[PDB]
Subunit: 116 residues, 3 copies
């Protein structure tokens, strides 16, 4: 009946759960400066949040992927993304260009998933 | 079983409800020209639509926030956003740069929420 | 209990279904080079995926519409979109500017819908 929250601050909660759905905040990279490293860090953050929320990679429903420079970084994004995904179990996805809150951020990914 | 709609025109419905979920159209500002005023107006429009749809601020699940100029306006957006939110009950959120349908629009916010 | 998938490749599934919800990957045009033709092709692809997933146009819940050039193409997008929609049954929607994965792609649309 009530949404529950994980890692709440004044602006956002890292995850919000409602019934069988998990809504994740857009995840941004860690300390990597390169597109490959940043995508790894974003996806690692998503996997931990899925775990915390009672979900898993195999239960992702949708991912919107934002790239600062889609022409430059789409191939690198796809390389890391396809290796990270569980085989044969890819989610719905949309990949578009958008600047993120800091100019050094090259990639940000927003996930909705199903509770297990 | 059926989705229901609020404020339907030829292009969109301001809100679409399905079971316990409320999907809002991206809300744009009123008459304000400044980022603070425009964010206030967007958020006021969202709160009325939540009320109409049987939801409330405390039941927002996700918000995607689009800023015309994220470097310039992120801090002002966060100031108004954090004051508008119910304390300790922030939703999942993603903030990215995108031009909106009119060049004078600085901010647009798309919300999904839970029916009460 | 389990999400099911339609048209899965190494990067994405064209549709992911979970309970009464259908999540579509962002759909891109076919061979058209013009905005009118491309929007027709995107929307035709969405309608087939809705059919495959047990949904229909009348059960769309949300659409995010991405335009490469929102100032240039918003009016053409709206013309094709409003004619494609079932009368009086428009979904929630958000339209923003974003470059897509290829520079020749002018429009991409991401839909969530309700199973019938």
């Amino acid at each position: 009946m009530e949404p529950t929250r994980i890692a709440t601050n004044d602006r956002l909660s890292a995850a919000v759960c409602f019934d069988a759905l998990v809504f994740l905040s857009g995840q941004v990279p860690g300390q990597a400066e390169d597109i490959h490293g940043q995508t790894r860090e974003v996806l690692a953050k998503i996997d931990a949040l899925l775990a915390e929320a009672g979900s898993r990679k195999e239960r992702i429903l949708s991912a919107t992927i934002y790239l600062k420079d889609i022409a430059r970084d789409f191939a690198a994004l796809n390389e890391v993304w396809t290796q990270w995904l569980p085989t044969g179990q890819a989610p719905s996805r949309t990949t578009v260009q958008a600047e993120l809150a800091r100019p050094s951020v090259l990639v940000e990914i927003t996930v909705v998933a199903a509770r297990g």
